[PDB]
Structure formats: structure tokens, C-alpha cells
Design an enzyme around this catalytic site. Sequence first.
Site, PDB file in Angstrom:
ATOM      1  N   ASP A  43       0.851  -1.180   0.000  1.00 43.53           N
ATOM      2  CA  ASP A  43       0.000   0.000   0.000  1.00 43.53           C
ATOM      3  C   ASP A  43       0.894   1.239   0.000  1.00 43.53           C
ATOM      4  O   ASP A  43       1.628   1.414   0.955  1.00 43.53           O
ATOM      5  CB  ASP A  43      -1.000   0.034   1.148  1.00 43.53           C
ATOM      6  CG  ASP A  43      -1.886   1.279   1.011  1.00 43.53           C
ATOM      7  OD1 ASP A  43      -2.811   1.204   0.170  1.00 43.53           O
ATOM      8  OD2 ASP A  43      -1.571   2.255   1.741  1.00 43.53           O
ATOM      9  N   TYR A  48       3.215   9.980   0.554  1.00 41.22           N
ATOM     10  CA  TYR A  48       4.047   9.390   1.623  1.00 41.22           C
ATOM     11  C   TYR A  48       5.512   9.682   1.379  1.00 41.22           C
ATOM     12  O   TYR A  48       6.351   9.422   2.246  1.00 41.22           O
ATOM     13  CB  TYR A  48       3.808   7.880   1.710  1.00 41.22           C
ATOM     14  CG  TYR A  48       2.410   7.433   2.033  1.00 41.22           C
ATOM     15  CD1 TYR A  48       1.410   8.296   2.411  1.00 41.22           C
ATOM     16  CD2 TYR A  48       2.040   6.089   1.928  1.00 41.22           C
ATOM     17  CE1 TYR A  48       0.137   7.884   2.694  1.00 41.22           C
ATOM     18  CE2 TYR A  48       0.765   5.662   2.210  1.00 41.22           C
ATOM     19  CZ  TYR A  48      -0.204   6.559   2.584  1.00 41.22           C
ATOM     20  OH  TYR A  48      -1.497   6.177   2.902  1.00 41.22           O
ATOM     21  N   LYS A  77      -2.264   5.905  -4.801  1.00 40.47           N
ATOM     22  CA  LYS A  77      -3.366   6.795  -4.554  1.00 40.47           C
ATOM     23  C   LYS A  77      -3.076   8.200  -5.079  1.00 40.47           C
ATOM     24  O   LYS A  77      -1.933   8.682  -4.955  1.00 40.47           O
ATOM     25  CB  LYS A  77      -3.723   6.924  -3.068  1.00 40.47           C
ATOM     26  CG  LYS A  77      -3.648   5.732  -2.156  1.00 40.47           C
ATOM     27  CD  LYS A  77      -4.165   5.720  -0.788  1.00 40.47           C
ATOM     28  CE  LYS A  77      -3.801   4.506   0.072  1.00 40.47           C
ATOM     29  NZ  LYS A  77      -2.359   4.501   0.480  1.00 40.47           N
TER      30      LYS A  77
END
Length: 315
Positions: A43, A48, A77
Site C-alpha cells: 500500500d 508518503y 493513490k
Amino acid sequence: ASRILLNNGAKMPILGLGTWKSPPGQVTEAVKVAIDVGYRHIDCAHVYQNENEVGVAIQEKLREQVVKREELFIVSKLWCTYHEKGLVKGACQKTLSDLKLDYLDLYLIHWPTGFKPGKEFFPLDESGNVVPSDTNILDTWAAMEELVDEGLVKAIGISNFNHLQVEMILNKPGLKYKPAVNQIECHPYLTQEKLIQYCQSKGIVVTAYSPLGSPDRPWAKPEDPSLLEDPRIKAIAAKHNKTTAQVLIRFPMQRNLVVIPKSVTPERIAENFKVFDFELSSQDMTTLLSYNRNWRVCALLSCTSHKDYPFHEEF
Ligand SMILES: NC(=O)c1ccc[n+]([C@@H]2O[C@H](COP(=O)([O-])OP(=O)(O)OC[C@H]3O[C@@H](n4cnc5c(N)ncnc54)[C@H](OP(=O)(O)O)[C@@H]3O)[C@@H](O)[C@H]2O)c1
Ligand SMILES: O=C(O)Cc1nn(Cc2nc3cc(C(F)(F)F)ccc3s2)c(=O)c2ccccc12
């Protein structure tokens, strides 16, 4: 089974490695260790700031022939500052380039809220309010649909969408692809029965994030609840000769959720995977559900005035 069928016909591993807060210097070895001990789902997210270092690991393990690409399920994402239709492809392409992939297995709208485009992830006004973008979720979804039609991603989904937001996508005029996943915070302090039942009833697979209560979240406070230190959860673990973390990862698995615990600690990475050899009892499951307190790890104050803020509403 270790994988769950999505509405795009592809299978998704129900245990993945989380990467939020994994320092860029330690996440390459972390992902390497994970793949080595069984993980096949990672993920990721552009926000990030570690997708380059994640990708280094994926690529080494592919080169090493430890695993084939088809056997991997890599998730990223779309960050809030790229909801504009002209920016979605490039955002995805940046992620793919950094992860050293030619496709993603799954690409999520990261939050329902679009923010002003720019180099800043959280553009604020002089008074600390997040600066919105005037993009809406339906147009952002058409843009996500185009990624499928261009082969950059195999599945698309959403993240942190409430029941009414999900419903707006499912009811989108001209909907071409349903969302495959809704990734939401979920643990014994935030059990989400209603939202999960809604999504599952609609063939949307739910991924549970922060399943250990994100003890390394940078805004944690002394008085916050702590899942891993909850004596009631520890007792359940003691009964099964498992660790508290292992109970907290097995709990969502038994609710037909996907769960993505994060660690950069090799011994915890390995521990966290050893959750397929035991079962919680139905009573254990209801007992853990009873600890709900609508306690949220992820819900930034600066964002509570965005028109599309997902958590005012019941669920
Ligand atoms: N969609 C979104 O909005 C969203 C939001 C939040 C998170 N997520 C995703 O979900 C993932 C997981 O959530 P999270 O990162 O917030 O937190 P989490 O997985 O609930 O907790 C990670 C924390 O737990 C520690 N830990 C891991 N395994 C442990 C074990 N067996 N025993 C004791 N401590 C352990 C980790 O320490 P070490 O790392 O030091 O071992 C780290 O401090 C993220 O990393 C991200 O991939 C998505
Ligand atoms: O994002 C992650 O994966 C982890 C995550 N969570 N949060 C708390 C957040 N709360 C939000 C609430 C909204 C809201 F939609 F509700 F307005 C929108 C956006 C956010 S970010 C962060 O501030 C953050 C910052 C850097 C990297 C990761 C994160």
C-alpha cells in the site's frame, strides 16, 4: 482464502504492507523483507514521499526473480492536489515511474476532497484552513476511469468516502467502472459496521487502514486510546497464544476486509504475516466489535470546512 475477488475480476491479497511514515532510508529493506516472507500487496501513496524507495525494493525482487509481477498487488493513490482532470494522468505516471512499474493493480482517489494544485500537499490560507479546489468527485472519477482505458491501472477505487459519497459515485450519470475498493480507517475503536455493510452489499471490497491504531502517527497524545495496550485485546491474544498485533490484523480479515498493517521492523513484518494459522471465534469477533468508540486517527482539523469533508455525517 488469502485473496479476495474484486469487481474488476482480479484477485487482491487480503494482507498488505503499509508504507505511511516508513522512513525513506528503511522502507527499501522493509519491502524486501516483506516480499521475502510472503507479502504480495504493498500500500503506497505519492503523499508518503517514499515511492521511489519502495520501488527500488519491488524492482530488486522482480529482478532477483523472487516473485513475478503478476503475483504482486501494488496500490497507490491520487493525492488531493491533483483532482483536476488535466493532472490525474501525470500524477499516476509519476507514481508508476517512482515505483518502477508499468501499471498499478489498484489506484485510489486518496480522499474525497480536492485541494488547490501546486507544489504544496496541504495548501493553507493565512488562517490555517486548507485551500479547496473546485473539482468534484464525479469528474475526478471519470479521470480515474480513463486510466483504466489507457492500461495504466487495472482497478480504480476510493478512500475515505462516506456512505453518501460512495452512493454518489455508484449513482454517477454515465458511470463506466464501479469502484473496486473503499479504503477506510477501521479497528476495534472505529468498527464501521454501517459503512462496511453498505460497501460489501454493493460489491465494493473494503480495506482497513491503521488497524493497529497507528501508534506512530505524528499527532498522537498521551490520553488517546491505545489498541496495542488494551488489556481486553491482550487477553484475547493470550487465549490464542498470539500477539495483540496479530489479533488486530486477524480481526478485519474475518470481516472479509483487506488489511494493511505498516512496519519497517523486520521481526514485526514477519510476525504480522503469521495470521493465517489461527481463527478468532465469533464471540471474540463480537467482543472486539463492542469496543467501538468512533475514535479516529485520521481526520485533520484544517480540513473540516472542505465542502466534501467526509466525517461530519453518521457514516
Ligand atoms: N487511505 C488513507 O487515508 C490512509 C490513512 C492512514 C493509513 N493508510 C495506509 O494504512 C497503513 C497502516 O496504517 P498506519 O501506518 O497508520 O498504522 P498501523 O499499521 O495501525 O500502525 C503502524 C505502527 O505500528 C507499529 N507496529 C507494526 N507492527 C507491530 C507489531 N507487530 N507490534 C507492535 N507494533 C507494531 C509500527 O512500528 P514500526 O514501523 O516501528 O515497526 C508503526 O509504529 C499505512 O501505513 C498506509 O499504507 C491509508
Ligand atoms: O492520508 C493518509 O494516507 C495518511 C495521512 N493522514 N493525514 C491526516 C489527514 N486527514 C485528512 C482529512 C481530509 C478530509 F478529507 F477529511 F478533508 C483530507 C486529507 C486528510 S490527510 C495527514 O495529515 C497526512 C499527512 C501526510 C501524509 C499522510 C497523511
